[PDB]
Amino acid sequence: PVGQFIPYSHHVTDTIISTKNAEYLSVWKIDGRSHQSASEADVFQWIRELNNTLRGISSANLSLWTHIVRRRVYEYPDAEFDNVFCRQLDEKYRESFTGYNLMVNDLYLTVVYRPVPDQKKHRQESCIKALEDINRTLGQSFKRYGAELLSVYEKGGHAFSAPLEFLARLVNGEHIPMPICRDRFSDYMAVNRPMFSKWGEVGELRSLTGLRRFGMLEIREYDDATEPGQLNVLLESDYEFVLTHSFSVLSRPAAKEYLQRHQKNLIDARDVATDQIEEIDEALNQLISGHFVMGEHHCTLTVYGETVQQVRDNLAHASAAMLDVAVLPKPVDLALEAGYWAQLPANWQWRPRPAPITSLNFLSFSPFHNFMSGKPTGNPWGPAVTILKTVSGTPLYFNFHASKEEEDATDKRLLGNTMLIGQSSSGKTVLLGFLLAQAQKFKPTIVAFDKDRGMEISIRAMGGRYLPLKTGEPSGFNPFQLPPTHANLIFLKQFVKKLAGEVTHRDEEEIDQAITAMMSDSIDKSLRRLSLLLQFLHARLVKWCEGGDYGWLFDNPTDALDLSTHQIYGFDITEFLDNPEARTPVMMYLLYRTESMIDGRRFMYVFDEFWKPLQDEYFEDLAKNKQKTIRKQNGIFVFATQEPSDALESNIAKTLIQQCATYIFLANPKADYEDYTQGFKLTDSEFELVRGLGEFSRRFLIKQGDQSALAEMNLGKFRTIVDGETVERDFDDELLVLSGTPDNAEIAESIIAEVGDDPAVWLPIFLDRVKAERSDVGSGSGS
Amino acid sequence: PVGQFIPYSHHVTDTIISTKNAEYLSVWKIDGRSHQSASEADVFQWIRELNNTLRGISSANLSLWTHIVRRRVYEYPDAEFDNVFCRQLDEKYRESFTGYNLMVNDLYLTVVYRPVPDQKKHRQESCIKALEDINRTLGQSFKRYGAELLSVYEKGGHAFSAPLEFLARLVNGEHIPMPICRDRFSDYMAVNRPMFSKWGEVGELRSLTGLRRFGMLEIREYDDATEPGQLNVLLESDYEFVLTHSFSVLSRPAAKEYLQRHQKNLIDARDVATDQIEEIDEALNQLISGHFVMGEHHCTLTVYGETVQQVRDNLAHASAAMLDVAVLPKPVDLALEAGYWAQLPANWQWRPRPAPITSLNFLSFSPFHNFMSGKPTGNPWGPAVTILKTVSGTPLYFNFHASKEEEDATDKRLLGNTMLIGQSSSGKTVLLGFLLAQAQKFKPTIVAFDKDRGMEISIRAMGGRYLPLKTGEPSGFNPFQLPPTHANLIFLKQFVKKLAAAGRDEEEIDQAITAMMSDSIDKSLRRLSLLLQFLPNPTVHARLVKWCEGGDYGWLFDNPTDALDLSTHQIYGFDITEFLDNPEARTPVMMYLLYRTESMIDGRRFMYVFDEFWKPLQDEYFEDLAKNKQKTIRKQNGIFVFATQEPSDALESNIAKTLIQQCATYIFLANPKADYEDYTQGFKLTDSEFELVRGLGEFSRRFLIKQGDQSALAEMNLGKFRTIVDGETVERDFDDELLVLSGTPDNAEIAESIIAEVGDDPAVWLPIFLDRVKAERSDVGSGSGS
């Protein structure tokens, strides 16, 4: 049958998996350091640190199985928006990938402990303690690597097994979420059994997504040298394959005996003393000195597909890309019937060929892969944008919340803050408008604070509120002046930031309590109450000058209910570089209102030049306490500053950098310098990349946690429906997200003054008309 | 398994590999000598020179194994052009090759020294010295044979050891690049494992690319009367075969004793086969003097294919083609298995029948005769173009980077200068355009100096500039001379070459003119106008103004700048049509053009193109800068290609003879005139190659291509149609012979139309205007006048 060939039986604890041969397993899901944004000394230092780690995690009680699974992305739920602009953008982006081969490649590392009644239970508990020590040391040496211990999807429904299903994805060919029952896992739990041909050419695998066929390659006689990332040319890899590097650790005297027999072979060659006995004696010296640790090893690449000519084509391309880098893959005959059963990490019996390798040549073969999202689908929301063009590589799946320095991981969901920095108008607002437009698939309510009349047409076409501020016109927000919790506290803050220990600090709290007790008795009084509050018990200055603050509650009604009608809200903080005269009270009560509003969804506070308005100590107290409370309770801050080396002088910017998850560096030219390496936590290669992309390349360095790569937008794509359609250029709905100020501002104002409700169906029609007039007559006629 | 049948062990030195029985191999690749160019009686002289070499290194430790491998060439890449006209020409030429005679054959020779603890190391260190001596001898003897000693290939990505890959090709069936590693080669070479069954079955070879089958033919006859090319009739056939000849040298007592045994059985005892007893006595005295060397020799023909009826058909067709040359093949039974392991050059065990033959009957059965075929890959650039219609169908794979007897040091990549010889432009311009398009395949920086408005449509459609430079139109000023880069020396040389024509060393006077000209820093047309309006204050500004003629339209001086894409292109062209000396017109404009285009690109693909190359290079400055420019530009990846209309007029000069001496690929087009003591003296042909060039004809564009020491005829043949395609609606080719051939009244009107009638940078105005050329000239042009 099939159940005798798969050795697992979960009977111990969360991370450890027992079996019938009394072995124990523990699976890690890693997404390692990117192999595109680092120097050669950095990857050499990484391999040296990993070898110094694995030198202690040794001594014959260990088997490490590194799996590199390149898999299609069937789990991605591309869905609808229920507004026509964002659905049009999703349609253009989804069919803007003309054969991009959307595959993601995750890593796994299986740690297997094998030692060689109540005493057997004691030995089992000793293996549990020993493997927990191994897992603790491995997690302490994988802090840069993003290695989540994979006993993490527990208690979903009725006790689902997370160190399982990866051991199903090897054996079934599809990620089936395994249930834990009081039974054995080898009975009939692994459902989709594969079958083999009688000659052993290509095996078949009857999954639920369709019948597949697979072929394998075994690596033998690899090169005597070892590049650190030597076999990373199989990550582009149009294969949907599974790579398995098994290293079962041999002890020191067993490895010394193996080199003794190898020297006996190389010295008793029939009159060919090939002078190769000078590096194996050096290897014996490194073994006795303790610099190495050797063990048995086999590498199997199982490439999947269908229509066996295509499987053989993939096998031939894999053999070509392997022999390019000086390893020799032999194909497999009927021993493939054992080789797939050598895929599982409890398979010393059906092991194809145990080549003894040193640990440096094992870490040099599986060091780790390029950059993707560690959770493509599975975030606290859905995946925001399937960003293409990690440059010559996989997709991105850009998320606002990925990871951070994982200390005290409990009592928090995930840090979600992002810093979308870049040079002034060099491709910042188009990316921010695109991300805020694409994020609407799981219903957030974004609140934006602009730089200078930017992102206007995007938020206005999304259905947003977007009041544009001018401070002279009476159309503006009014002081609401009715919280029945700490009206005295907000009267204190209003008095001190209206006079602008402010000036003398003499009994202003008595003025606040007097105006509260004389005016508010108790609830639901109108502009009579607001007029008493404005008049008597900005303040003295506008009271004696009559000019400069018309936009506040100066015979303006209580516009306080306007935070349940729309979803996107937008305020222009353009003419407010004169803080703390005007910018900090306005944003003080705006952030007061919009922080009293928390609707449970992702409240995305979008800032443009966040260091400009937040220049008061009240916003420092908010950037401590409110930032902790909002990044706790399903809130997301999206900053976009422009001059970060001019922003780094304030400590508010420092404490907002230190609590920010994902960074985007867009178009920083050579005018900026080595201060990206300190504060922003970069290496030298990442700053070299962001300075070497140039000025008008419109691609950005994305960095999440300890991973970094590049990303583009690719606004040139076309599709083929039956014959090859026209080139779309992604230029329809591109001037609406770029937000050129005069055309979009004038036409948006005039056609919200022409048709009443804010349209997604009628605003871009005449917006397209008024943009096409300029873009056709002004740019084609005169030459 | 198979690891006991394939006898190889580790590399011992750079070029010598080992065996599990302590034999030492060294693999040469022999780009063999071209035999269908001189095959009257010099073939016997080549065979006698090779036998006089092989008698020197007789050395009964030795065993030679030579392999003729016909391979269906797959490594020639598809040519992505990123153009429209040149891509159309590449598509038309690629569909022009349905001529099924692909399969380049390459010839290898493995020298196997078989030497019959620390003493074993001494044995190895003596066998290395002996095989290095034999390698030096065979290198000095195969100098004209295009030899290359296959070394350990020190950078593929780490180290890739490539005499081993050919040793893989005998056992695997494809060029598998075998990486050198910490394991003997007997355990990991045989990737594609063979299979054999029983009586009535040919061998199977289950490769990853597809299933293959193979049969074997064994040479077993008592034939003596051999010719030096008796088995090159298979060198044009289509089997994808591997033909192995093995010759292990018999020792002198064993050779004399077995020759005594065979002569007792043959030339004596009352039958004697009269009269075959005469050669044996003098040959026995020659063997006691060593003039013969007898050796165990066998030969197998492994014929590859698929669909075993087709393998049996190819075996029967090879049987007929070898029965044509009085050789009797035999099919191989179950000993095919052993016979397949008879191909690897360390197996004296699995040999079919080690019958002894002499050295001349081994060097005559398998000499290094080869149809000329260039490198498909491996050249430092991309391969240029394949051209068929050579000696018996096999393709050529033309390449500029072909070796020579020069390069005493291996400093540059490969010598790559080329020149065409032909009279009256008899289809020269079409060949130069057809080479320029397939050179535009791998993006070069072409600079051309055309003769009389030729190559103008090809350059203009290829993304070129093509200054007309003519003293006859209402326009014409295209020269600037304004910014100085090598100011004092080069503009001093240009001034003294512009004014110095009086019959007297005005060098310091011109130096003071340049010193008063440079006023002061970074000046424009104001500075050039100051240079024009400097006072006379003898050889003076008078002849300068009167030999620019005043309002210098055809001339170089008194111009504005023409700064428009002088460096941001890929193809530049100039004309020297109305340029002849007295007055000195052609030399300063050529000096200025070579000076400005010297430092165009230092490092990437550069190709100087010259038409009538002996015409501008006449003065002594051109000799000095030609020698220095060759010596410093051949290292900086700048190759040349010349073309002349007369051989004898080009051989009249001396610096032109120096440039002839340093070329690397000659293409002799067509000469019925054929002055005898110029082709064989200056351009270095033999007598039979010159007779070939004379008998080539006068209008057909069949040309003798000679590169290295190989020579073969070729025809580019852009006049051939086809018979089938996927879109079965049209199967004839007609175009692109009227755009590269570039008749000057067509090119003048194409330039006038691209200036005034339409206006376009790329080749997008072309095809209806090509109809406006062709159909309009055929209907209302030549035939119907008025």
Numbering used by the authors:
A (entry chain A): 15 to 130, 146 to 529, 533 to 569, 584 to 829
B (entry chain B): 15 to 130, 146 to 532, 538 to 571, 581 to 829
Q: What does the paper behind this entry write?
A:
In Gram-negative bacteria, conjugation is mediated by a large transport apparatus—the conjugative type IV secretion system (T4SS)—produced by the donor cell and embedded in both its outer and inner membranes. The T4SS also elaborates a long extracellular filament—the conjugative pilus—that is essential for DNA transfer. Here we present a single-particle cryo-EM structure of a T4SS complex from the R388 plasmid that comprises all four sub-complexes: OMCC, stalk, arches and IMC. Three ATPases, VirB4 (also known as TrwK), VirB11 (also known as TrwD) and VirD4, power the system.
We first solved the structure of VirB4 in its unbound form (VirB4unbound) and fitted and rebuilt the structure within the IMC density. The dimer interface between VirB4central and VirB4outside is mediated entirely by the N-terminal domains of each subunit.
